[PDB]
């Protein structure tokens, strides 16, 4: 079933044809052009591969996801955030945020220069966005992802100061569900993500939700760079 | 006559007071801030000036216009589109379409970094939209403009491959007609646009439509990013 793409076409096979093991392996090759990525996210597919490997495309089953309103903020964290030392912005510094996610040296190692450029382009073309957590004047955390209507595909988050991540995920969610936001894609469920409320659902249901929310919208100025949380 | 705009205000003078030669010259100055720009379109005035010159605002008489249903499509173009090698999307890459137009060099030359940013702001705010034409993984054509209700002001189009721009306009028009679209402003008629079916009407006539149509309303999600036409 595994299909190998080419520059000749930006078309992906159907998600349903993905492999079980590894879970979701749908295709390889192609490029990371704005067009190909938009076509991919539009069909519930996303790129993920380690450096040195050809571009690998996925559509796992089940699919990890997170309902905004179902975010789990610990008792200790609400106390922390009630007196948060951070300020949160939107699309003020996409480059630093994804560089942050790339830096750490864990699941962000896949984010190579090539990946960085590709998503930075999407951010400029207006589809990939970032939330920035600030401590004083320095960036200590944040997250970025690709928007798909009222749906948000979370690519990655990073932190250089205690509770910076959660702060972004926390505030983004309030801002998100307050303006029509309906869903966040986590791709594959892990520990940190689970501890935040991420829950699995069937791929078919995810795709069902996907082309249901991609044609929706949020306020015109929702992604306009601005301040999301400042005491 | 004529009029210098002020950073202070954001108001414009009556289009009817514009010059005859050069046809449309109404005012000069101000800036390209979202507000002033948007107000200009409301009033049937648009900015146009060569790099180096001060901002120039226009409202020509007659005004070039294109009734969507009257878009002329040659028989060989129909043949081609039927087996089209192109993909058409909406608001996938506004920045590239405008940059694509700012390179047409016949006269996309007026489109400076200043103009690109100005229209890019309108796009960020949801007033300026783009229609892209893709050949495989390459952007080979498109068009962008400012939405005015059910009226649509075409700013420019570009083409890097045979019939690329004609399919953009063809696919757009279908989409546009389908959901209430009523008229496309073409500003000043030119050989190409005229062959696609564009025509001239009086400025007072155009303004009339503009006022009626700016109140119009397209589906709530008409402009969200999406594919409009997938090749075969
Ligand atoms: N794959 C990402 C999904 C995600 C990114 C950003 C915000 C929320 C979720 C993760 O595991 O963190
Ligand atoms: N002023 C434009 C009008 C137009 C642009 C794009 C699409 C349709 C019409 C031109 O002739 O370049």
Short mmCIF file of C-alpha atoms and ligand atoms in Angstrom, two decimals:
data_model
loop_
_atom_site.label_atom_id
_atom_site.label_comp_id
_atom_site.label_asym_id
_atom_site.label_seq_id
_atom_site.Cartn_x
_atom_site.Cartn_y
_atom_site.Cartn_z
CA UNK A 1 0.00 0.00 0.00
CA UNK A 2 2.87 2.39 0.87
CA UNK A 3 2.91 5.05 -1.86
CA UNK A 4 5.99 7.01 -2.89
CA UNK A 5 5.26 10.59 -3.89
CA UNK A 6 6.98 12.79 -6.51
CA UNK A 7 7.24 16.42 -7.66
CA UNK A 8 4.75 15.49 -10.35
CA UNK A 9 1.82 15.42 -7.93
CA UNK A 10 0.69 16.89 -4.63
CA UNK A 11 -1.87 14.12 -4.17
CA UNK A 12 -1.73 11.65 -1.29
CA UNK A 13 -3.42 8.25 -1.29
CA UNK A 14 -6.32 7.72 1.11
CA UNK A 15 -5.57 7.63 4.89
CA UNK A 16 -7.56 4.41 5.21
CA UNK A 17 -4.73 2.70 3.34
CA UNK A 18 -2.10 3.54 5.96
CA UNK A 19 -0.21 0.71 7.64
CA UNK A 20 -1.04 -0.62 11.10
CA UNK A 21 2.62 -1.10 12.08
CA UNK A 22 4.18 1.36 12.22
CA UNK A 23 0.83 2.99 12.91
CA UNK A 24 -0.22 5.34 10.15
CA UNK A 25 2.67 5.15 7.69
CA UNK A 26 0.93 6.38 4.56
CA UNK A 27 3.57 7.62 2.11
CA UNK A 28 7.15 8.73 1.50
CA UNK A 29 9.01 11.25 -0.63
CA UNK A 30 7.66 14.41 -2.22
CA UNK A 31 8.69 17.71 -0.66
CA UNK A 32 7.56 20.16 2.03
CA UNK A 33 6.19 22.83 -0.36
CA UNK A 34 3.39 25.05 1.02
CA UNK A 35 1.00 23.42 -1.42
CA UNK A 36 1.82 19.83 -0.53
CA UNK A 37 1.58 20.50 3.21
CA UNK A 38 -1.74 22.31 2.95
CA UNK A 39 -3.05 19.42 0.86
CA UNK A 40 -1.78 16.99 3.50
CA UNK A 41 -3.20 18.72 6.59
CA UNK A 42 -6.39 19.11 4.61
CA UNK A 43 -6.62 15.32 4.42
CA UNK A 44 -5.50 14.43 7.93
CA UNK A 45 -1.93 13.68 6.94
CA UNK A 46 1.28 15.08 8.35
CA UNK A 47 5.03 14.74 7.82
CA UNK A 48 7.35 13.21 10.39
CA UNK A 49 10.72 11.63 9.82
CA UNK A 50 14.16 11.58 11.40
CA UNK A 51 17.07 13.49 9.79
CA UNK A 52 18.67 11.49 6.99
CA UNK A 53 15.43 9.68 6.20
CA UNK A 54 13.12 10.41 3.30
CA UNK A 55 10.02 12.45 4.13
CA UNK A 56 7.52 10.11 5.81
CA UNK A 57 3.76 10.87 5.82
CA UNK A 58 1.25 9.73 8.41
CA UNK A 59 -2.38 9.35 9.36
CA UNK A 60 -2.41 7.16 12.50
CA UNK A 61 -5.34 5.17 13.91
CA UNK A 62 -6.41 5.90 16.54
CA UNK A 63 -5.61 9.61 16.48
CA UNK A 64 -4.64 11.50 19.64
CA UNK A 65 -6.68 14.65 20.05
CA UNK A 66 -7.61 17.26 22.64
CA UNK A 67 -10.92 18.98 23.26
CA UNK A 68 -10.07 22.54 24.40
CA UNK A 69 -12.65 22.66 27.17
CA UNK A 70 -11.40 19.29 28.39
CA UNK A 71 -7.95 20.60 29.16
CA UNK A 72 -6.79 19.41 32.58
CA UNK A 73 -5.17 22.19 34.62
CA UNK A 74 -3.84 20.95 37.95
CA UNK A 75 -4.91 22.60 41.20
CA UNK A 76 -1.31 23.71 41.74
CA UNK A 77 -1.11 25.18 38.21
CA UNK A 78 -4.30 27.24 38.50
CA UNK A 79 -2.73 28.68 41.65
CA UNK A 80 0.48 29.21 39.67
CA UNK A 81 -1.33 30.86 36.74
CA UNK A 82 -3.59 32.93 39.01
CA UNK A 83 -0.33 34.72 39.76
CA UNK A 84 1.47 33.89 36.52
CA UNK A 85 4.93 35.46 36.00
CA UNK A 86 4.48 35.06 32.25
CA UNK A 87 2.92 37.02 29.39
CA UNK A 88 1.50 35.21 26.36
CA UNK A 89 1.53 36.50 22.79
CA UNK A 90 0.31 35.20 19.44
CA UNK A 91 2.37 35.08 16.22
CA UNK A 92 4.93 37.60 17.56
CA UNK A 93 7.87 35.30 16.99
CA UNK A 94 7.16 32.13 15.03
CA UNK A 95 10.84 31.60 14.19
CA UNK A 96 11.99 31.55 17.82
CA UNK A 97 9.17 29.22 18.91
CA UNK A 98 9.81 26.51 16.35
CA UNK A 99 13.54 26.97 16.96
CA UNK A 100 12.77 26.34 20.60
CA UNK A 101 10.94 23.12 19.82
CA UNK A 102 13.81 22.08 17.56
CA UNK A 103 16.45 22.94 20.13
CA UNK A 104 15.60 20.82 23.20
CA UNK A 105 16.89 17.49 21.70
CA UNK A 106 14.06 14.96 22.17
CA UNK A 107 11.04 14.66 19.85
CA UNK A 108 12.06 18.01 18.38
CA UNK A 109 15.16 16.53 16.78
CA UNK A 110 13.11 15.74 13.68
CA UNK A 111 12.63 19.48 13.22
CA UNK A 112 15.63 20.07 10.93
CA UNK A 113 16.50 23.26 9.05
CA UNK A 114 14.41 21.93 6.18
CA UNK A 115 11.39 21.47 8.40
CA UNK A 116 11.91 24.86 9.99
CA UNK A 117 11.93 26.63 6.62
CA UNK A 118 8.87 24.73 5.37
CA UNK A 119 6.72 25.63 8.36
CA UNK A 120 8.07 29.16 8.55
CA UNK A 121 6.70 29.57 5.01
CA UNK A 122 3.29 28.34 6.15
CA UNK A 123 3.42 30.84 8.99
CA UNK A 124 4.04 33.59 6.47
CA UNK A 125 1.35 32.33 4.11
CA UNK A 126 -0.89 32.49 7.19
CA UNK A 127 -1.64 28.89 8.11
CA UNK A 128 0.94 27.95 10.74
CA UNK A 129 0.77 29.85 14.01
CA UNK A 130 2.63 30.25 17.28
CA UNK A 131 1.90 31.10 20.90
CA UNK A 132 4.78 32.66 22.82
CA UNK A 133 5.37 32.52 26.60
CA UNK A 134 7.45 35.43 27.92
CA UNK A 135 9.34 35.91 31.16
CA UNK A 136 10.56 39.49 31.34
CA UNK A 137 11.70 40.08 27.74
CA UNK A 138 12.94 36.56 27.05
CA UNK A 139 11.05 33.72 25.36
CA UNK A 140 10.87 30.84 27.83
CA UNK A 141 8.32 28.71 26.03
CA UNK A 142 5.50 28.35 23.57
CA UNK A 143 3.99 26.21 20.85
CA UNK A 144 3.08 26.22 17.20
CA UNK A 145 0.83 24.34 14.82
CA UNK A 146 -1.16 24.44 11.63
CA UNK A 147 -4.69 25.82 11.61
CA UNK A 148 -7.44 23.97 9.81
CA UNK A 149 -10.54 26.08 10.26
CA UNK A 150 -11.91 25.73 13.79
CA UNK A 151 -9.47 22.81 14.17
CA UNK A 152 -5.86 23.20 15.31
CA UNK A 153 -3.09 20.76 14.57
CA UNK A 154 -0.55 21.00 17.35
CA UNK A 155 2.91 20.28 15.95
CA UNK A 156 5.04 20.90 19.00
CA UNK A 157 5.56 22.81 22.24
CA UNK A 158 8.73 23.55 24.24
CA UNK A 159 9.73 24.91 27.59
CA UNK A 160 12.75 26.58 29.17
CA UNK A 161 11.04 27.53 32.42
CA UNK A 162 8.67 25.66 34.74
CA UNK A 163 5.04 25.71 33.58
CA UNK A 164 5.77 27.75 30.42
CA UNK A 165 4.30 25.06 28.11
CA UNK A 166 1.08 24.58 30.10
CA UNK A 167 0.70 28.35 30.23
CA UNK A 168 0.60 28.53 26.44
CA UNK A 169 -1.63 25.45 26.10
CA UNK A 170 -3.81 26.83 28.90
CA UNK A 171 -4.31 30.36 27.55
CA UNK A 172 -4.50 29.29 23.91
CA UNK A 173 -7.37 27.03 24.86
CA UNK A 174 -9.33 29.76 26.60
CA UNK A 175 -8.75 32.10 23.66
CA UNK A 176 -9.54 29.25 21.28
CA UNK A 177 -12.87 27.91 22.79
CA UNK A 178 -14.00 31.53 23.40
CA UNK A 179 -13.94 32.34 19.71
CA UNK A 180 -15.37 29.24 18.12
CA UNK A 181 -12.30 27.06 18.38
CA UNK A 182 -13.49 23.47 18.50
CA UNK A 183 -10.58 21.03 18.36
CA UNK A 184 -6.83 20.38 18.69
CA UNK A 185 -4.99 17.56 16.95
CA UNK A 186 -2.19 15.97 18.97
CA UNK A 187 -1.39 13.36 16.33
CA UNK A 188 0.07 10.69 18.63
CA UNK A 189 -0.84 10.50 22.33
CA UNK A 190 2.07 10.45 24.80
CA UNK A 191 2.44 11.03 28.55
CA UNK A 192 2.72 14.82 28.85
CA UNK A 193 -0.08 15.22 26.33
CA UNK A 194 -2.31 12.63 28.07
CA UNK A 195 -1.75 14.30 31.44
CA UNK A 196 -3.19 17.40 29.79
CA UNK A 197 -6.42 15.81 28.57
CA UNK A 198 -5.47 14.35 25.21
CA UNK A 199 -7.66 11.36 24.40
CA UNK A 200 -7.70 8.87 21.54
CA UNK A 201 -10.41 8.55 18.91
CA UNK A 202 -10.71 6.52 15.69
CA UNK A 203 -9.01 7.90 12.57
CA UNK A 204 -12.28 7.83 10.62
CA UNK A 205 -13.88 9.97 13.29
CA UNK A 206 -10.91 12.32 13.21
CA UNK A 207 -11.13 12.72 9.44
CA UNK A 208 -14.88 13.12 9.89
CA UNK A 209 -14.28 15.99 12.32
CA UNK A 210 -11.48 17.36 10.14
CA UNK A 211 -13.36 18.21 6.93
CA UNK A 212 -16.18 19.38 9.15
CA UNK A 213 -14.02 21.97 10.90
CA UNK A 214 -11.70 22.98 8.04
CA UNK A 215 -14.50 24.92 6.34
CA UNK A 216 -15.40 26.70 9.54
CA UNK A 217 -13.77 29.93 10.64
CA UNK A 218 -12.87 32.14 13.62
CA UNK A 219 -12.94 35.95 13.90
CA UNK A 220 -11.04 37.64 11.06
CA UNK A 221 -8.53 39.05 13.50
CA UNK A 222 -8.13 35.86 15.53
CA UNK A 223 -4.67 35.05 14.14
CA UNK A 224 -3.54 38.66 13.96
CA UNK A 225 -0.35 39.00 16.03
CA UNK A 226 -1.35 40.23 19.50
CA UNK A 227 -1.18 39.88 23.28
CA UNK A 228 -3.20 36.97 24.71
CA UNK A 229 -2.39 37.18 28.43
CA UNK A 230 -0.72 39.95 30.39
CA UNK A 231 -1.51 40.74 34.06
CA UNK B 1 -9.12 71.05 -7.90
CA UNK B 2 -7.44 67.77 -6.85
CA UNK B 3 -6.65 67.08 -3.19
CA UNK B 4 -3.84 66.19 -0.82
CA UNK B 5 -4.91 63.66 1.81
CA UNK B 6 -3.72 63.98 5.41
CA UNK B 7 -2.30 61.49 7.89
CA UNK B 8 -4.72 63.28 10.20
CA UNK B 9 -7.94 62.30 8.41
CA UNK B 10 -8.84 59.24 6.31
CA UNK B 11 -11.63 60.77 4.25
CA UNK B 12 -11.78 61.04 0.48
CA UNK B 13 -13.22 63.61 -1.98
CA UNK B 14 -16.16 62.95 -4.32
CA UNK B 15 -15.06 60.64 -7.17
CA UNK B 16 -17.14 62.71 -9.57
CA UNK B 17 -14.66 65.54 -9.11
CA UNK B 18 -11.78 63.49 -10.54
CA UNK B 19 -9.88 64.47 -13.69
CA UNK B 20 -10.63 63.40 -17.26
CA UNK B 21 -7.03 63.22 -18.39
CA UNK B 22 -5.40 61.34 -16.79
CA UNK B 23 -8.76 59.54 -16.44
CA UNK B 24 -9.51 59.13 -12.75
CA UNK B 25 -6.83 61.14 -10.94
CA UNK B 26 -8.65 62.13 -7.76
CA UNK B 27 -6.07 62.66 -5.02
CA UNK B 28 -2.51 62.10 -3.82
CA UNK B 29 -0.95 61.43 -0.43
CA UNK B 30 -1.91 59.84 2.86
CA UNK B 31 -0.80 56.25 3.35
CA UNK B 32 -1.86 52.66 2.71
CA UNK B 33 -3.16 51.90 6.18
CA UNK B 34 -5.94 49.27 6.35
CA UNK B 35 -8.48 51.93 7.26
CA UNK B 36 -7.72 54.44 4.53
CA UNK B 37 -7.38 51.66 1.95
CA UNK B 38 -10.62 50.03 2.93
CA UNK B 39 -12.40 53.40 2.86
CA UNK B 40 -11.12 54.01 -0.67
CA UNK B 41 -12.71 50.79 -1.93
CA UNK B 42 -15.95 51.66 -0.16
CA UNK B 43 -15.89 54.90 -2.16
CA UNK B 44 -14.93 53.31 -5.48
CA UNK B 45 -11.42 54.77 -5.38
CA UNK B 46 -8.21 52.77 -5.60
CA UNK B 47 -4.47 53.57 -5.24
CA UNK B 48 -2.07 53.31 -8.18
CA UNK B 49 1.32 54.93 -8.65
CA UNK B 50 4.74 54.22 -10.03
CA UNK B 51 7.63 53.51 -7.60
CA UNK B 52 9.06 56.82 -6.53
CA UNK B 53 5.93 58.89 -7.11
CA UNK B 54 3.64 59.94 -4.27
CA UNK B 55 0.51 57.84 -3.67
CA UNK B 56 -2.14 58.42 -6.32
CA UNK B 57 -5.82 57.62 -5.92
CA UNK B 58 -8.18 56.84 -8.76
CA UNK B 59 -11.80 56.55 -9.82
CA UNK B 60 -11.94 56.47 -13.64
CA UNK B 61 -14.92 57.18 -15.88
CA UNK B 62 -15.88 54.89 -17.42
CA UNK B 63 -14.98 52.08 -15.04
CA UNK B 64 -14.03 48.64 -16.40
CA UNK B 65 -16.26 45.88 -15.12
CA UNK B 66 -16.89 42.15 -15.53
CA UNK B 67 -20.26 40.51 -15.02
CA UNK B 68 -19.37 37.01 -13.72
CA UNK B 69 -21.97 35.12 -15.81
CA UNK B 70 -20.75 36.88 -18.94
CA UNK B 71 -17.18 35.66 -18.61
CA UNK B 72 -16.17 34.69 -22.12
CA UNK B 73 -14.55 31.27 -22.44
CA UNK B 74 -13.23 30.21 -25.85
CA UNK B 75 -14.11 26.76 -27.17
CA UNK B 76 -10.50 25.54 -26.94
CA UNK B 77 -10.29 26.84 -23.35
CA UNK B 78 -13.39 24.79 -22.53
CA UNK B 79 -11.63 21.84 -24.15
CA UNK B 80 -8.55 22.48 -22.10
CA UNK B 81 -10.33 22.98 -18.73
CA UNK B 82 -12.35 19.84 -19.28
CA UNK B 83 -9.01 17.95 -19.10
CA UNK B 84 -7.27 20.62 -17.00
CA UNK B 85 -3.71 20.05 -15.67
CA UNK B 86 -4.27 22.74 -13.03
CA UNK B 87 -5.43 22.86 -9.45
CA UNK B 88 -7.19 25.93 -8.07
CA UNK B 89 -7.26 26.94 -4.40
CA UNK B 90 -8.44 30.02 -2.50
CA UNK B 91 -6.33 31.99 0.02
CA UNK B 92 -3.65 29.31 0.19
CA UNK B 93 -0.85 31.71 -0.69
CA UNK B 94 -1.90 35.35 -0.94
CA UNK B 95 1.69 36.48 -0.42
CA UNK B 96 2.89 34.49 -3.41
CA UNK B 97 0.12 35.54 -5.76
CA UNK B 98 0.71 39.21 -5.07
CA UNK B 99 4.47 38.73 -5.32
CA UNK B 100 3.73 36.83 -8.52
CA UNK B 101 1.89 39.85 -9.86
CA UNK B 102 4.55 42.26 -8.64
CA UNK B 103 6.90 40.53 -11.08
CA UNK B 104 4.76 40.48 -14.24
CA UNK B 105 7.07 43.39 -15.12
CA UNK B 106 4.74 44.68 -17.86
CA UNK B 107 3.24 46.76 -15.04
CA UNK B 108 3.11 44.75 -11.84
CA UNK B 109 6.01 47.09 -11.33
CA UNK B 110 3.85 49.58 -9.43
CA UNK B 111 3.51 46.86 -6.78
CA UNK B 112 6.32 47.80 -4.38
CA UNK B 113 7.30 46.30 -1.03
CA UNK B 114 5.12 49.09 0.36
CA UNK B 115 2.06 48.03 -1.64
CA UNK B 116 2.61 44.31 -0.96
CA UNK B 117 2.65 44.90 2.80
CA UNK B 118 -0.39 47.17 2.56
CA UNK B 119 -2.46 44.58 0.76
CA UNK B 120 -1.00 41.87 2.90
CA UNK B 121 -2.52 43.65 5.90
CA UNK B 122 -5.97 43.63 4.26
CA UNK B 123 -5.50 39.92 3.71
CA UNK B 124 -4.51 39.36 7.33
CA UNK B 125 -7.70 41.17 8.31
CA UNK B 126 -9.88 39.22 5.89
CA UNK B 127 -10.67 41.81 3.19
CA UNK B 128 -8.14 40.93 0.50
CA UNK B 129 -8.29 37.42 -0.96
CA UNK B 130 -6.35 35.38 -3.46
CA UNK B 131 -7.07 32.61 -5.97
CA UNK B 132 -4.11 30.38 -6.78
CA UNK B 133 -3.51 28.13 -9.76
CA UNK B 134 -1.21 25.16 -9.22
CA UNK B 135 0.53 22.97 -11.75
CA UNK B 136 1.68 19.91 -9.83
CA UNK B 137 3.53 21.38 -6.85
CA UNK B 138 4.32 24.71 -8.60
CA UNK B 139 2.34 27.97 -8.38
CA UNK B 140 1.81 28.90 -12.01
CA UNK B 141 -0.75 31.68 -11.80
CA UNK B 142 -3.46 33.49 -9.89
CA UNK B 143 -5.23 36.66 -8.89
CA UNK B 144 -5.99 38.69 -5.81
CA UNK B 145 -8.39 41.43 -4.86
CA UNK B 146 -10.42 43.23 -2.24
CA UNK B 147 -13.85 41.92 -1.29
CA UNK B 148 -16.71 44.37 -1.12
CA UNK B 149 -19.74 42.32 -0.14
CA UNK B 150 -20.99 40.65 -3.31
CA UNK B 151 -18.82 42.95 -5.35
CA UNK B 152 -15.19 41.99 -5.87
CA UNK B 153 -12.44 44.35 -6.90
CA UNK B 154 -9.87 42.58 -9.01
CA UNK B 155 -6.44 43.99 -8.31
CA UNK B 156 -4.33 41.89 -10.60
CA UNK B 157 -3.62 38.49 -12.07
CA UNK B 158 -0.49 36.77 -13.34
CA UNK B 159 0.48 33.80 -15.44
CA UNK B 160 3.56 31.60 -15.68
CA UNK B 161 1.89 28.87 -17.77
CA UNK B 162 -0.60 28.73 -20.65
CA UNK B 163 -4.19 29.44 -19.57
CA UNK B 164 -3.21 29.57 -15.90
CA UNK B 165 -4.88 32.94 -15.25
CA UNK B 166 -7.88 32.12 -17.42
CA UNK B 167 -8.61 29.04 -15.31
CA UNK B 168 -8.27 31.09 -12.10
CA UNK B 169 -10.86 33.59 -13.32
CA UNK B 170 -13.00 30.78 -14.77
CA UNK B 171 -13.01 28.72 -11.57
CA UNK B 172 -13.44 31.83 -9.37
CA UNK B 173 -16.37 33.12 -11.38
CA UNK B 174 -18.12 29.75 -11.08
CA UNK B 175 -17.55 29.70 -7.31
CA UNK B 176 -18.44 33.38 -7.05
CA UNK B 177 -21.61 33.16 -9.11
CA UNK B 178 -22.72 30.09 -7.21
CA UNK B 179 -22.80 31.86 -3.87
CA UNK B 180 -24.26 35.28 -4.64
CA UNK B 181 -21.33 36.99 -6.32
CA UNK B 182 -22.65 39.77 -8.51
CA UNK B 183 -19.84 41.81 -10.04
CA UNK B 184 -16.12 42.08 -10.59
CA UNK B 185 -14.47 45.50 -10.77
CA UNK B 186 -11.63 45.53 -13.30
CA UNK B 187 -10.76 49.22 -12.90
CA UNK B 188 -9.46 50.01 -16.37
CA UNK B 189 -10.22 47.83 -19.38
CA UNK B 190 -7.25 46.31 -21.27
CA UNK B 191 -6.97 43.98 -24.27
CA UNK B 192 -6.87 40.78 -22.15
CA UNK B 193 -9.65 41.61 -19.71
CA UNK B 194 -11.75 42.89 -22.61
CA UNK B 195 -11.44 39.54 -24.39
CA UNK B 196 -12.54 37.73 -21.24
CA UNK B 197 -15.76 39.68 -21.47
CA UNK B 198 -14.99 42.81 -19.43
CA UNK B 199 -16.85 45.99 -20.39
CA UNK B 200 -17.15 49.68 -19.59
CA UNK B 201 -19.97 51.41 -17.74
CA UNK B 202 -20.26 54.98 -16.38
CA UNK B 203 -18.54 55.88 -13.11
CA UNK B 204 -21.85 56.96 -11.59
CA UNK B 205 -23.27 53.60 -12.66
CA UNK B 206 -20.39 51.67 -11.08
CA UNK B 207 -20.61 53.68 -7.86
CA UNK B 208 -24.31 52.88 -7.73
CA UNK B 209 -23.59 49.14 -7.90
CA UNK B 210 -20.76 49.52 -5.41
CA UNK B 211 -23.12 51.06 -2.86
CA UNK B 212 -25.75 48.38 -3.43
CA UNK B 213 -23.29 45.51 -3.43
CA UNK B 214 -21.02 46.50 -0.52
CA UNK B 215 -24.10 45.79 1.62
CA UNK B 216 -24.39 42.38 0.01
CA UNK B 217 -23.27 39.27 1.83
CA UNK B 218 -21.63 36.06 0.63
CA UNK B 219 -21.79 32.82 2.62
CA UNK B 220 -20.13 33.21 6.00
CA UNK B 221 -17.23 30.94 5.05
CA UNK B 222 -16.93 31.80 1.35
CA UNK B 223 -13.37 33.05 1.79
CA UNK B 224 -11.86 30.50 4.18
CA UNK B 225 -8.86 28.61 2.70
CA UNK B 226 -9.88 25.67 0.52
CA UNK B 227 -9.49 23.84 -2.78
CA UNK B 228 -11.89 25.03 -5.52
CA UNK B 229 -10.93 22.82 -8.41
CA UNK B 230 -8.88 19.62 -8.44
CA UNK B 231 -7.27 18.50 -11.72
CA UNK B 232 -7.60 14.97 -13.14
N1 LIG C 1 2.45 16.18 18.82
C1 LIG C 1 2.28 17.34 19.75
C2 LIG C 1 0.82 17.80 19.72
C3 LIG C 1 0.60 19.16 20.32
C4 LIG C 1 1.38 20.25 19.93
C5 LIG C 1 1.12 21.54 20.41
C6 LIG C 1 0.07 21.74 21.31
C7 LIG C 1 -0.72 20.66 21.71
C8 LIG C 1 -0.45 19.38 21.21
C9 LIG C 1 2.69 16.96 21.19
O1 LIG C 1 2.77 15.75 21.47
O2 LIG C 1 2.93 17.89 22.00
N1 LIG C 2 -7.14 45.36 -12.87
C1 LIG C 2 -7.14 43.91 -13.17
C2 LIG C 2 -8.56 43.37 -13.03
C3 LIG C 2 -8.63 41.92 -12.64
C4 LIG C 2 -7.61 41.30 -11.90
C5 LIG C 2 -7.71 39.97 -11.53
C6 LIG C 2 -8.84 39.24 -11.89
C7 LIG C 2 -9.85 39.84 -12.62
C8 LIG C 2 -9.74 41.17 -12.99
C9 LIG C 2 -6.27 43.53 -14.36
O1 LIG C 2 -6.73 43.68 -15.51
O2 LIG C 2 -5.12 43.08 -14.13
#
